[PDB]
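Budget justification aside, the reviewers requested a transparent look at the raw inputs and outputs of the sequence design task funded under Objective 1. We therefore reproduce one unedited record. The lines immediately below are the structure tokens for a 135-residue chain.
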């Protein structure tokens, strides 16, 4: 039939679900941060259509990307938080959930950084000016 041996008990996945529930919330909180970007992105793009000169436009973008940077940091906390998490090799689903989340974090931080970097790089190129090294 189907030989089974491990402990001889089985009592549902109570705590397993609890640990998993928190993990679930983490992805959502992440989903919310990611959602805020798309929301802010929509309003920014709308405003981006035109309103002020390049001076303010470039000014808004640099400020825009930097704020984007703050969003990336939140994503960083997700990885760092999970990174400093403790869990044995028993929670297969919970662990699989965390690992997949880690990569979500990698893309979320990076995707967010690219947007901020692009907006920054575009504005950055627009302004170069000179420099002076003395002290």
């Amino acid at each position: 039939g189907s030989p089974e041996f491990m402990l001889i008990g089985e009592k549902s996945n109570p705590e397993e679900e609890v640990e998993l529930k928190k993990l679930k919330d983490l992805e959502v909180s992440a989903e919310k941060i990611a959602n805020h970007l798309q929301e802010l992105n929509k309003e920014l793009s709308g405003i981006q259509q035109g309103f002020l000169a390049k001076e303010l436009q470039a000014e808004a973008l640099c400020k825009l990307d930097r704020k984007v940077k703050a969003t990336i940091e939140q994503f960083m906390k997700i990885l760092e938080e999970i990174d400093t998490m403790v869990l044995p090799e028993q929670f297969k689903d919970s662990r699989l959930k965390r690992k997949n989340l880690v990569k979500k974090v990698q893309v979320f931080l990076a995707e967010c950084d690219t947007v901020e970097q692009y907006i920054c790089q575009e504005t950055e190129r627009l302004q170069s000016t000179n420099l002076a090294l003395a002290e």
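The longest helix spans residues 14-48. The domain at 1-135 is CATH 1.20.58.120 (Methane Monooxygenase Hydroxylase; Chain G, domain 1). Computational costs for records of this kind are itemized in the attached budget.
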